[PDB]
Scaffold this motif. Sequence first.
Motif, PDB file in Angstrom:
ATOM      1  N   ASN A 138     -17.418 100.726 -21.601  1.00 39.86           N
ATOM      2  CA  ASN A 138     -16.615  99.436 -21.470  1.00 39.86           C
ATOM      3  C   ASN A 138     -16.708  98.690 -20.127  1.00 39.86           C
ATOM      4  O   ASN A 138     -16.933  97.690 -19.671  1.00 39.86           O
ATOM      5  CB  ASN A 138     -15.277  99.076 -22.375  1.00 39.86           C
ATOM      6  CG  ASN A 138     -15.008  97.807 -22.662  1.00 39.86           C
ATOM      7  OD1 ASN A 138     -15.282  97.286 -23.719  1.00 39.86           O
ATOM      8  ND2 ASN A 138     -14.304  96.848 -21.975  1.00 39.86           N
ATOM      9  N   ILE A 139     -16.636  99.751 -19.305  1.00 38.68           N
ATOM     10  CA  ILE A 139     -16.253  99.672 -17.749  1.00 38.68           C
ATOM     11  C   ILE A 139     -17.803  99.343 -17.043  1.00 38.68           C
ATOM     12  O   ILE A 139     -18.684 100.441 -16.886  1.00 38.68           O
ATOM     13  CB  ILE A 139     -15.819 101.049 -17.029  1.00 38.68           C
ATOM     14  CG1 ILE A 139     -14.507 101.113 -17.726  1.00 38.68           C
ATOM     15  CG2 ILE A 139     -15.796 100.888 -15.536  1.00 38.68           C
ATOM     16  CD1 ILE A 139     -13.636  99.897 -17.413  1.00 38.68           C
ATOM     17  N   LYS A 140     -18.082  98.131 -16.663  1.00 37.22           N
ATOM     18  CA  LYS A 140     -19.405  97.683 -16.221  1.00 37.22           C
ATOM     19  C   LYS A 140     -19.768  97.812 -14.811  1.00 37.22           C
ATOM     20  O   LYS A 140     -20.895  97.506 -14.342  1.00 37.22           O
ATOM     21  CB  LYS A 140     -19.982  96.513 -17.175  1.00 37.22           C
ATOM     22  CG  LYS A 140     -20.269  96.530 -18.344  1.00 37.22           C
ATOM     23  CD  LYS A 140     -21.134  95.451 -19.140  1.00 37.22           C
ATOM     24  CE  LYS A 140     -22.307  95.448 -18.955  1.00 37.22           C
ATOM     25  NZ  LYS A 140     -22.973  94.088 -18.333  1.00 37.22           N
ATOM     26  N   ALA A 141     -18.682  98.105 -14.100  1.00 36.92           N
ATOM     27  CA  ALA A 141     -18.755  98.051 -12.326  1.00 36.92           C
ATOM     28  C   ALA A 141     -19.758  99.037 -11.848  1.00 36.92           C
ATOM     29  O   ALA A 141     -19.983 100.211 -12.588  1.00 36.92           O
ATOM     30  CB  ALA A 141     -17.381  98.237 -11.936  1.00 36.92           C
ATOM     31  N   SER A 142     -20.316  98.817 -10.780  1.00 34.47           N
ATOM     32  CA  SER A 142     -21.298  99.840 -10.154  1.00 34.47           C
ATOM     33  C   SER A 142     -20.543 100.801  -9.245  1.00 34.47           C
ATOM     34  O   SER A 142     -20.994 101.957  -8.786  1.00 34.47           O
ATOM     35  CB  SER A 142     -22.137  99.053  -9.474  1.00 34.47           C
ATOM     36  OG  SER A 142     -22.363  97.981  -9.553  1.00 34.47           O
ATOM     37  N   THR A 143     -19.403 100.538  -8.760  1.00 38.49           N
ATOM     38  CA  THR A 143     -18.615 101.130  -7.558  1.00 38.49           C
ATOM     39  C   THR A 143     -17.364 101.687  -8.217  1.00 38.49           C
ATOM     40  O   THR A 143     -16.936 101.321  -9.239  1.00 38.49           O
ATOM     41  CB  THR A 143     -18.305 100.326  -6.291  1.00 38.49           C
ATOM     42  OG1 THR A 143     -17.514  99.154  -6.791  1.00 38.49           O
ATOM     43  CG2 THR A 143     -19.656  99.680  -5.657  1.00 38.49           C
ATOM     44  N   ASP A 144     -16.755 102.654  -7.639  1.00 33.04           N
ATOM     45  CA  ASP A 144     -15.567 103.172  -8.213  1.00 33.04           C
ATOM     46  C   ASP A 144     -14.407 102.124  -7.869  1.00 33.04           C
ATOM     47  O   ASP A 144     -13.624 102.190  -8.655  1.00 33.04           O
ATOM     48  CB  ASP A 144     -15.058 104.660  -7.351  1.00 33.04           C
ATOM     49  CG  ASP A 144     -15.810 105.788  -8.149  1.00 33.04           C
ATOM     50  OD1 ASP A 144     -16.647 105.600  -9.131  1.00 33.04           O
ATOM     51  OD2 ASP A 144     -15.641 106.920  -7.313  1.00 33.04           O
ATOM     52  N   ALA A 196      -5.595  91.537  -9.867  1.00 33.48           N
ATOM     53  CA  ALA A 196      -6.462  91.975 -11.048  1.00 33.48           C
ATOM     54  C   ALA A 196      -7.887  91.212 -11.231  1.00 33.48           C
ATOM     55  O   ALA A 196      -8.596  91.526 -11.923  1.00 33.48           O
ATOM     56  CB  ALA A 196      -5.840  91.961 -12.230  1.00 33.48           C
ATOM     57  N   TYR A 197      -7.712  90.148 -10.289  1.00 32.91           N
ATOM     58  CA  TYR A 197      -9.060  89.180 -10.431  1.00 32.91           C
ATOM     59  C   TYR A 197     -10.239  89.625  -9.403  1.00 32.91           C
ATOM     60  O   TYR A 197     -11.118  88.997  -9.501  1.00 32.91           O
ATOM     61  CB  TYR A 197      -8.523  87.694 -10.065  1.00 32.91           C
ATOM     62  CG  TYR A 197      -7.565  87.251 -11.400  1.00 32.91           C
ATOM     63  CD1 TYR A 197      -6.207  87.533 -11.003  1.00 32.91           C
ATOM     64  CD2 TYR A 197      -8.069  86.813 -12.555  1.00 32.91           C
ATOM     65  CE1 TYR A 197      -5.418  87.352 -12.082  1.00 32.91           C
ATOM     66  CE2 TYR A 197      -7.306  86.558 -13.669  1.00 32.91           C
ATOM     67  CZ  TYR A 197      -5.929  86.686 -13.282  1.00 32.91           C
ATOM     68  OH  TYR A 197      -4.874  86.592 -14.180  1.00 32.91           O
ATOM     69  N   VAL A 198      -9.955  90.588  -8.646  1.00 33.53           N
ATOM     70  CA  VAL A 198     -11.124  91.304  -8.188  1.00 33.53           C
ATOM     71  C   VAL A 198     -12.138  91.920  -9.068  1.00 33.53           C
ATOM     72  O   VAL A 198     -13.443  92.073  -8.906  1.00 33.53           O
ATOM     73  CB  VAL A 198     -10.956  91.908  -6.926  1.00 33.53           C
ATOM     74  CG1 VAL A 198      -9.419  92.024  -6.371  1.00 33.53           C
ATOM     75  CG2 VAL A 198     -11.488  93.457  -6.830  1.00 33.53           C
ATOM     76  N   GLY A 199     -11.631  92.310 -10.247  1.00 32.44           N
ATOM     77  CA  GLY A 199     -12.485  92.810 -11.262  1.00 32.44           C
ATOM     78  C   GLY A 199     -12.805  91.876 -12.354  1.00 32.44           C
ATOM     79  O   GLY A 199     -13.608  92.532 -13.220  1.00 32.44           O
ATOM     80  N   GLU A 200     -12.702  90.686 -12.111  1.00 32.61           N
ATOM     81  CA  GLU A 200     -13.437  89.645 -12.855  1.00 32.61           C
ATOM     82  C   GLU A 200     -14.835  89.552 -12.840  1.00 32.61           C
ATOM     83  O   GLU A 200     -15.509  89.599 -13.717  1.00 32.61           O
ATOM     84  CB  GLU A 200     -12.652  88.088 -12.730  1.00 32.61           C
ATOM     85  CG  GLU A 200     -13.368  87.080 -13.591  1.00 32.61           C
ATOM     86  CD  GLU A 200     -12.868  85.705 -13.772  1.00 32.61           C
ATOM     87  OE1 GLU A 200     -12.081  85.478 -12.657  1.00 32.61           O
ATOM     88  OE2 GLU A 200     -12.829  85.216 -14.672  1.00 32.61           O
TER      89      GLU A 200
END
Lengths: 386, 36
Positions: free
Chosen positions: A116-122, A205-209
């Motif tokens: 579910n987690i689609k981000a590239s960086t930690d 929490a909106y940096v992860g939008e």
Amino acid sequence: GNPFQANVEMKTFMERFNLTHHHQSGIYVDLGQDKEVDGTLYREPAGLCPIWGKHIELQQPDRPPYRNNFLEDVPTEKEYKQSGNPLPGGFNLNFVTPSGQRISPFPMELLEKNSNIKASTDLGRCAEFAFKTVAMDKNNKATKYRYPFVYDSKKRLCHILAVSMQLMEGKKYCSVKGEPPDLTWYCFKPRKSVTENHHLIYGSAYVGENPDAFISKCPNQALRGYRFGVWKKGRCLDYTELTDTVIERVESKAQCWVKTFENDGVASDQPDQPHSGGVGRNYGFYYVDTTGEGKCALSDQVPDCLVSDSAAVSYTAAGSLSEETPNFIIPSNPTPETALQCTADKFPDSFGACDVQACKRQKTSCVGGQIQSTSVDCTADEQNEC
Amino acid sequence: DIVQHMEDIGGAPPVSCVTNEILGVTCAPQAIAKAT
Ligand SMILES: *[C@@H]1O[C@H](CO)[C@@H](O)[C@H](O)[C@H]1NC(C)=O
């Protein structure tokens, strides 16, 4: 001809310093948005950029059970009954699934192998996690309200904070070190320290939008070898040359980085419910002045150019003390190091017109395969004009 | 009003559960501390 505005690569690089454009909220205190839960409007942290080194300093009494640490669980009713005022614990959300699994802190290892987690960086993975957490109302219905997070890059733990408040002061509402004694709340405020908690990253929490966007859009690192400036009268003026700049004598560069975040003009949303949109004294650089004194220049003008200076370091309220990209923000595959490069062969010395008011001119060149930008004395006859 | 003041400095909604996309519904295992 502002070399820092001259092509697409440069415009994008420079734009990463524009906290009004990309972060868009308070920095010191981020409360940029309002959200409804059960018919009440609540303030919500809203900034798009992560805030490196920000932590919330607690002022609880210096005795058990108090730990003065915002990453400790919010207090249980039980714990409070066993302690008296003020409330103990910290800001960490302590919720669990029915099987007992904690929402916070959450191990990064579990986030890097989850579909579910689609981000590239930690750091993004942690932001995204925060973004995918919403509060439930009195009917158990999901709302649009999201709690901020802190990544602990040293422990690879992602925290969701049950507490969005960032600044509480006034002996009317909170106590410092248990004084006065009947008070519910201990006082607390946002800090950056010259030595501590550099590995903590605070964010709405909106940096992860768009979890990957902070990498090319935010001024994540300190910028070595340049001074922030604004292009004006045909050359790059660093903040030392502007009227509204605040200059303090400092003992080290770290103090300057702290000051860009802690000066009283920094973007803040703290009361009345103001929204800075990210405007404020958010920018500065450490430098050694002509007499050998270490100084700090603090400004509210968004950089649109750079003055070259190997002994200088430019900081912002958002960014780290660290001047190099850490691994927790590099993708498993931005241009932070490369955008400022040239070769002598192609980049020739171009001297701008004489600014007659200061009697200087821009000079732009390539020295050590990097762009250099400074102000030199006008030519001799050009000086007739001053 | 203390509630207005709290709201103003970012006081949170009084909530017992959160939904997270990776863990689903997440709730406080014990009563959360309230007031004085
Ligand atoms: C910074 O951001 C805002 C919104 O994008 C813009 O109006 C402002 O002029 C920008 N400043 C720059 C690029 O110097």
